[PDB]
């Protein structure tokens, strides 16, 4: 049989797909996640804050 | 309207009538589901049949549907006075970029 | 009970914009996609647009793409349709329908009341 | 030892609200999602609702959506189920179960003792 | 109750019984897991089998199960006096918006 | 109205690189795949490359594979074509087209204006 | 150019001409669709016919096409002066690694 | 240009394993299937194994099935051959070839340079 | 070697020689394509003819091939000093579980 | 000048005109609010709309606004002679070190 | 080497069910179909069932159709034979064989060891 | 055991439609073609229609072609016969039979119970 | 009931082509071969061409072979006839007929309405 | 012990030995990395290979490894007297609620 | 030096030269911006391009760059005598604990 990729296929998005949220997903916290401090963030982190005494 | 429906179908009260919906090889003959809607003259459409055999809670047992090959049919048994409404068949057409494709719309009049 | 209410319709001359809204209640808005369907006076039904539950994907009918814009606000439970460069062919009644999916095709389980948008000069 | 202790049941005439609770101990509450399941007297089990570990996603059964509200308090290790406008069909025994996920579907490994709500006139 | 279970099955002590759970092409025939629970007459359900082959610590080796095609069955060997309980199968159905779908619930009677 | 506007042509000595672009407006760029088609002066049309809607798949003609590279940026609605080690045989007018699929084959449903790439010494 | 075309076709105004595009058993004889493009002298190609029979909104009723066996034909009836353009047939060839294969291109000259 | 470079050969005593490799450049690796072919000294060519473009389907010759394993890594453009329980008759020069399909049968358009594997004691 | 080839073929420069590759009802007589390869004494095989008639870009016009029934042939016109190599035919055999089957191989000696 | 506003728009008295402010994915498309100010020719700018929907008591009900994606608009109905003033859109940009960013500004003209 | 090993046999009273299995090693399980063959004591051989390589087609003998069920699981390289409502005539030794096809008829190149199933009371 | 159970009969006035069905169990439905045979009261047997196992080929008697339509759904083991424009001489008992083939002609090995369809006014 | 409807006639100058179509209804089109029969005004009948049910086989009369082409489309239930280089002698009324075979010779059970083709200068 | 390892392997100094680690479709076959650890008899474990191919500074070039499918292996060349230690393979299993899963542990004995 | 840069490049005055920076799936191909720095032979480096397309006020319009996939390139057109400097590429790598990662460093020499 043909072992190569098929170039004659639909290259566009499928509108006939389920548009709703999936109830069959893992509802639990992920234990396999980066536990470290992520040395990539805005180090000048004064971007925008309330300048008044109260929120 | 890629789905073809008869413009009108009539029958006497108490008898059985059938509304057909004929498609092609891209929408119905490709294996996609056919759903039916009912619109009274002055209100929005209401879902009637989904999955080609199933019905919601409010819909009575009188309405039934089926599909086979390239065509699908909606069968109504025991016509009543309130069944005067427009019936639409909806499916998905492989050849377009839209979620739904509707039929022409069949107006049912019971000879009361 | 599921209750979808539309507004924003009216009479507008051709060539300018109009923004509709479909406020919802009685269900979790952010779990479902929404549709827009329009019916021309004396004609059948016509699918207009769809939006995903998260807003990531949008699909439009060939006759309205580039002019219409669909968006949602999950914090106000309100669906929007921004309609620009209106033509006389766009006069119809617009319905918002909640999305559903059975096996291989989707349907609309609960619909709104509908609003009338007319374009004339 | 995982413990799920429930309360909040009783007799309520139809038309008003009732709130349940499911106190937890013996595990990290904030790392797990929770379910609610009911069993009508002499009947089978019916899934009711689920909540995510952070509370972001909620899912309800079609027969209870819009009336029931599920929420959690990660600081008290407690789970709530706020039921509004109770119908006679809502009489059953209510359980809280801890969520789990194997490959492609989820199950409940630890269940609560159960509380029983009667609604009648 | 999408998943179908026979309402009751019985057997003599020391013999083998098989409880069945048959679904459709959307829940069990779609590749989703099947999980089994046991409920004694006066207590909350306990997990019996998960992942179609695995079992918790408290469950003895007598209980076992598997799945094939659209059908999943629970096989019990060495019936005992304490095995009288309601046994449910649970899976996920693609056609609704709920995490779990349960079965009807079989009652196991030990012919003591 | 679907608009595809191209840029980046010019005159280049053989052996070095050139980058074309096709800015887009009037449709949802991220929902569609795109093609590149070139036409040598006085010759017919030749298909060059395709890219999927998400960029996951790329296909090339046998005469340009390993030298050309097609890519897209969905946040700017722009399509690119990186041409390396240009040869004299690559002198043509390049068109960006929008992909469409009917039953068992695909076609190009809106085309761009075209740009001229000249390779000479 | 796996699909071969006549290099030129001419006809007087008001009559009917035919442009043919014959291929082999791997592109047109294998069941793949044939599409037609029109390129006016100074602009980019424009889609003329897709799906072997269908035409876009801008294309008038004068143009039509069909295929049978391993050949596809484009029928233009009632020539005008503005019909002078190159016509290309496009399909998919199973023996290559490309999405489209084009024909040689036929120039139509109207004998005004 | 299509370039296939192989390595991993050498001398290995019979009864134990060896791993070959074939690094690629000049084409999209994830679009093509690959072959392994060997030639005993002074003999003809012998087909060994094939792998699909996505790695879903593997086929082996009758004399090497159960012992040899073919795999690919699309992120490194590398083709592997894990050779286990080597015997004396497995002494040959191994080539990697790129799969092509014409009408009803396949061939290999581009071949590697070849690496020599000697099994001896 | 399910395909049979003569062990050697020789000829002086300037004339035409033929290399035959006979098969059976399962590989060549079953309608499967025949391809040819050339291997210089110290290098890897190089594709020569595919599809029983076609040649790649680098191959000159001297080499041509054809098949009829259960047999295939390779015609080499105008022998040169650089044509000394082994020539292999390849097909697919229905009776095995392999993608390719090779012939014995024919060594061409140019009588310089 | 990271925000873009039209140099000038005009309309008849009493009609509705649209003033738009198009931002980017960093200022408006990033989820930050847009505030509108109306500056009279002879005095300081006055707050018009805050929170993308909220207006002060002094601002009449004719003024309104909304935002979607990376763009925001100011909708003015019932144009009056006193509406002739400069309008600015204000948001916050993540990529800079400024609390506010101001657009080009729109001069509104009423065809009195 | 090809190894087919079965299990699940034993003694069963008539009228009830029993399950067999045939674990495999030494070849690609998902590339082949499998047969079941049985031999009553002191008698000849009898063909029972076959399954396709993907499990799409199943064929059963006339005497066992409607009662026996053949299935495969490509993840564990195992083949199953579910026997329901066994009769006294079903006592035999059951073999699992690997399918091969030559020209117009199939055969089994590799057989298992055999397992004994006795139906008696 | 092969079970063929027909349903859908009754009394219907002439000129309109009726739909029969034949539910199956005890054998692999998708491996067999089916037949419809009818018997007028007091008359002989008459062949009506046959459908292939995959539904690719349909054949009808000359006296019913154009009015009757046979169909199957392999996922529920059901056979259908859609009768349109029912006439008076269409009154008979209809059977569903399982197709079989011996050497040069076909027969029916298993039959259904049969339902009465009466057309009168 | 069998209806054959013909269209595509008219007046055409000699030397060029005209196309005919015979739409079918009331039977399974793919199960039958078809015929073309012509009758010049005042003359008898002449057989033109036959096409098999699957289109594999085609035959033509000696006086029209090499100029006419017969074809069918089983998905639209329509028969075609492409006549190239029409002459004056081709002026006749063309009929489409359904093929039938009795013992050793064929006949046409049902005939179409017919269409008139006029070739003159 | 979700990951399976041979309890012990051995080889003479100067030869090549191969330690394997077999997993399932949930830990190794799901695309998660495999890491190796070396524990001398009297000390804590030390990282040996991370990222399935990478090694720290202190680890010599002798140790190497790769994965394929559902299995990964650690190849050691040039056995030495100090290679007497316990080797553990580690990955992450999607099915549990733990960060790491360890194997049984393979003992390498140098045939001195 | 996870980012790879050519050790030295050259270009005649007035010609166009390119400086390439090659990364992997963790630094450049993972969606992190690439920044370019220019350092005179005797002073500190100075910012030249940030955000793969943007340059400060001091940098002339001659310097421009872009990124694609796992590679980045800095294009300098109209080479001048003062363009002789070391050019560095900077991004962020996911697998390390450093904010910046620099390349090998490219020396540009003008062939005056």
Numbering used by the authors:
A (entry chain I): 138 to 192
B (entry chain R), E (entry chain T), G (entry chain L), I (entry chain P), J (entry chain Z), N (entry chain V), ...: 2 to 9, 11 to 27, 27A, 27B, 27C, 28 to 95, 95A, 95B, ...
C (entry chain Q), D (entry chain S), F (entry chain H), H (entry chain O), K (entry chain M), L (entry chain E), ...: 1 to 52, 52A, 53 to 82, 82A, 82B, 82C, 83 to 100, 100A, ...
Passage from the reporting paper:
Many malaria vaccine candidates, like RTS,S, are based on P. falciparum circumsporozoite protein (PfCSP), which is the primary surface antigen of P. falciparum sporozoites, the stage of malaria parasites infectious to humans. The structure of PfCSP comprises three domains: (1) a flexible N-terminus, which contains a heparin sulfate binding site for hepatocyte attachment; (2) a central repeat region composed of 25 to 40 major (NANP) repeats, which are interspersed by a few, N-terminal minor repeats (NVDP, NPDP); and (3) a small, structured C-terminal domain. In each complex, CSP displays some form of helical structure that is stabilized by homotypic interfaces between tightly packed Fabs bound along the length of the NPNA repeats.
Each of the extended helices in complexes with 337, 334, 311, 356, and 239 are right-handed, while the partial, disc-like helices of 364 and 227 display left-handed curvature. T28 is a germline residue that is nearly strictly conserved (S28 in 337), while the S31N mutation is seen in four of the seven mAbs: 239, 311, 334, and 356. Our original mutant 311 construct, 311R, has four mutations in the heavy chain (N31S, R56N, N57K, E64K), and two in the light chain (R93S, R94S). While there is a range in the level of inhibition, many antibodies are highly potent and have statistically indistinguishable protection relative to mAb 317, namely mAbs 356, 311, 334, and 364.
